[PDB]
RNA sequence: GCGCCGCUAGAGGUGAAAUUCUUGGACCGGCGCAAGACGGACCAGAGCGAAAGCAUUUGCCAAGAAUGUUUUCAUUAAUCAAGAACGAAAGUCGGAGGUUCGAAGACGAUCAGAUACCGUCGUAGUUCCGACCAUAAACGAUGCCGACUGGCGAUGCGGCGGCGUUAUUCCCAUGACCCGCCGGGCAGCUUCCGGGAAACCAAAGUCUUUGGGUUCCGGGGGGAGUAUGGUUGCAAAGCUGAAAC
RNA sequence: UUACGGCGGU
């Protein structure tokens, strides 16, 4: 049924640690755990591995991407700036 | 004095008597 | 050459000039800049070819 | 305008009215006969129409279906029937 | 009461105009109430005219216009006087004030 | 005016006094008939069978030649469809909204003019409840809602 | 971003109600190799070695290559079932006109 | 902001100045680069939208008004307790970003005093993504739906009809303009329609000649949107909400 | 540029 109405994962940590860092943690914590769409065999297998591995269930492919999240922000950023400059100037 | 400036001197005033009844439980 | 060349009479503003005029009808039709992104490695005959005759 | 007869109106205030709103209401549309060029096949195809028109002997277009009034497409006969 | 029937602003069917700037203080103004002017200035100084075709390197050059539209707040449309007070009937025509060049 | 929009338009069609029919066309009250049952059966619904036989047919309104509507008597004889065309274009539209919506969640119009046409399904099916045309334990569930459409 | 994927995935959602097809892999595999192959279409996802050996019979069998600008799980979409499918291979388009079209 | 130059001693800021930056060369002039904001003039008493609100090109969508309709259904409708969806700005939480602007703050002036205006600098913030908060002079200070009651000039969108001008047009169809009518919209101008305490209003008119449907809400000024109970929110607070006097 | 106050009742 309705087993919570706030905590969510972090009912796990019980009464400690404070409620503002059980607040910051479970968004990363909720991230860190979830299946993601793989990008090469569509199937949502993309399970964490260690601390920025991320690997596919089906067609055992491993991924080097962010920590808490498959894709960090920053690094998508770059990816459009990487090869806005390659198309721009031809070098 | 002003109307907006009379609800900020009785919003600061009631987190006042707020607090007090807060500490005196 | 022939690029630059149509335009100290500006040739493009007047071809759309008469391309348009059974859409709406347009009076003051220029082509209000031209910026230069590339150059090709500058061959040094190139330029004394437009040095020339 | 106080005894203007509204039992009466004449023909040409009652032309220049909506097709409601009037004494007695009444479409603006027709129904008009397409001859094409070159066919021995009236169509009957109504004013306001909305579809691409197909014929059956020479089944090419005949109007062009548009915001209100259909377009025929190359000069073809037409009459107004009833 | 109702001053005026539009509310200072030319806006009708909206709920929000672009909010722009007063050029000499700089205050954000809506765009519709804002008192707008356009000067097509020549940028010589007409006194200076005979000073400048007289040391030219022609005889017949026609000489550039600045082109600046100020627009006001009316605080300060009001102060510098390109607004002027007007009575209470003879405020209701949108005409501006006739050209007077000569 | 409009139902879920604050328009107040005029614009509906104005049919003529007489009720009979036209001179010119000799063209009987069963030919009509064999006809919406021919074109019925192309996958057609009642709100395109008579738009096509007034354009290309001189057939104003199908009443005044056979007596009777142009569903009312697909319905006759067992080849008109469960659902109303007027319901069934209002789901084939909310499944339509819904699928834009899942993919842009961000789109906060698509999400306000989603339960004005999800409210329009419900006020009109509580008519054909009422009218019989619908089982009286019919309900539109989104889950099931694009099996409904074709 | 705009107007004309629907040139390609409206025909698609066509030939799926009119005509006939196979989706999978080893489906378009036996089409392709017994001539009823007419026009196959390929996910921008599928492994890059699979995208060879069908650019590779289809020149065998002189038919067409469209590459859809989509994920796998895109074109099981665009066909219009709760797959994701790679490869199909439409062998009668109904009365549409992907053939007829570009490639 | 930073590079590479050029020549010079001031630049900046102000009612006057100063704090400040500058021969480890500012400011200015040239050429490049990068970053983040923002889309001038065109831009209107113009358009769209339920409101908040919305402005560089092109692109996958999904919606919508009006008009046109000799299509279809045939009372399916209006307003709506309870219950929901959206909601400027500031604000709160986390991750990116951080150019300008800049609450707090430091400093220079100005003054009797300046904790203000003004100047130099600058944090949080302004920007994006996700979750919240649910209020504004959220204003036409005017609920929504329906009809009826003057004229006129226009404008925005469809539709219809007209002399003529203009486009590849050397013919055509479609455009640009010109003259009308029709519906819908934004408004304007006039009027003893009528109403109003008048300002003003073609609705705020059709009201002691008083009743078209329906929702919300007001009852002298303060106390007070307070106290208290409930409820929501991480918080700030929102909602409901008196009385003694 | 600076320009701040004017006892109560009549
Ligand atoms: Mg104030
Ligand atoms: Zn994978
Ligand atoms: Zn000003």
Redesign the interface.
Same mark, same amino acid.
């Given at each position: 049924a309705k087993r919570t109405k706030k905590v969510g994962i972090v009912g796990k940590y019980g009464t400690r640690y404070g409620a503002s860092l059980r607040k910051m943690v479970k968004k990363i914590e909720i991230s860190q755990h979830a299946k993601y769409t793989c990008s090469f065999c569509g199937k949502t297998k993309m399970k964490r591995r260690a601390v920025g591995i991320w690997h596919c269930g089906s067609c055992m492919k491993t991924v080097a991407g962010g920590a808490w999240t498959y894709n960090t922000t920053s690094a998508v950023t770059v990816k459009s700036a990487i090869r806005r400059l390659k198309e721009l100037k031809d070098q | 004095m002003r109307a907006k400036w009379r609800k900020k001197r009785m919003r600061r005033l009631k987190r006042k008597r707020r607090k007090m009844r807060q500490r005196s439980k | 050459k022939e690029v630059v060349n149509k335009l100290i009479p500006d040739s493009i503003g007047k071809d759309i000039e008469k391309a348009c005029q059974s859409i709406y009808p347009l009076h003051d039709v220029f082509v209000r800049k031209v910026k230069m992104l590339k150059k090709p490695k500058f061959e040094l005959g190139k330029l004394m070819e437009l040095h020339g005759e | 305008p106080l005894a203007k007869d509204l039992l009466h109106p004449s023909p040409e205030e009652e032309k220049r009215k909506? &097709? &409601?709103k009037r004494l +007695? %209401?009444?479409?603006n549309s027709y /129904?008009m006969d397409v001859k094409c060029p070159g066919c021995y096949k009236i @169509? @009957? +195809? /109504?004013s306001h =129409? %909305?579809?691409v +028109?197909?014929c059956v002997g020479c089944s090419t277009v005949l109007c062009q279906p548009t915001g209100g009034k =259909?377009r025929l497409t190359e000069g073809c006969s037409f009459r107004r &029937? %009833? | 009461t109702k001053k005026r029937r539009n509310n200072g602003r030319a806006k009708k069917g909206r709920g929000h105009v672009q909010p722009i700037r007063c050029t000499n203080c700089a205050r954000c103004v809506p765009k519709d109430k804002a008192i707008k002017k356009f000067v097509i200035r020549n940028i010589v100084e007409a006194a200076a005219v005979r000073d400048i075709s007289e040391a030219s390197v022609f005889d017949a050059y026609v000489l550039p216009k600045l082109y600046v539209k100020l627009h006001y707040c009316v605080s300060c449309a009001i102060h510098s006087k390109v607004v002027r007070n007007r009575s209470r009937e003879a405020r209701k025509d949108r005409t501006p004030p006739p050209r007077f060049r000569p | 005016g409009r139902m879920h929009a604050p328009g107040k338009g005029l614009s509906q069609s104005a049919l003529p006094y007489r009720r009979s029919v036209p001179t010119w066309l000799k063209l009987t009250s069963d030919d009509v008939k064999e006809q919406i049952y021919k074109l019925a059966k192309k996958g057609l619904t009642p709100s395109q069978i008579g738009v096509i036989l007034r354009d290309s047919h001189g057939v104003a309104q199908v009443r005044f030649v056979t007596g009777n509507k142009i569903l009312r008597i697909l319905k006759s004889k067992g080849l008109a469809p469960d659902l109303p065309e007027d319901l069934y274009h209002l789901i084939k539209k909310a499944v339509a909204v819904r699928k834009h919506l899942e993919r842009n969640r961000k789109d906060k119009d698509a999400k306000f003019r989603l339960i004005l046409i999800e409210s329009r399904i419900h006020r009109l099916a509580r008519y054909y409840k009422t009218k019989r045309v619908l089982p009286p334990n019919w309900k539109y569930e989104s889950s099931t809602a694009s099996a409904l459409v074709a | 971003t705009k107007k004309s994927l629907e040139s390609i995935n409206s025909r698609l959602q066509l030939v799926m109600k009119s005509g006939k097809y196979v989706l999978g892999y080893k489906q378009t595999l036996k089409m392709i190799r017994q001539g009823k192959a007419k026009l196959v279409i390929l996910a921008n996802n599928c492994p890059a070695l699979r995208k060879s050996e069908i650019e590779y019979y289809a020149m065998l069998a002189k038919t067409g290559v469209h590459h859809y600008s989509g994920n796998n799980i895109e074109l099981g979409t665009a066909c219009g079932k709760y797959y994701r499918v790679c490869t199909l291979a439409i062998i009668d388009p109904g009365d549409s006109d992907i053939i007829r079209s570009m490639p």
């Open positions: - | - | - | 909506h &097709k &409601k +007695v %209401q009444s479409p /129904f @169509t @009957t +195809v /109504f =129409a %909305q579809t +028109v197909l =259909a &029937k %009833q | - | - | -």
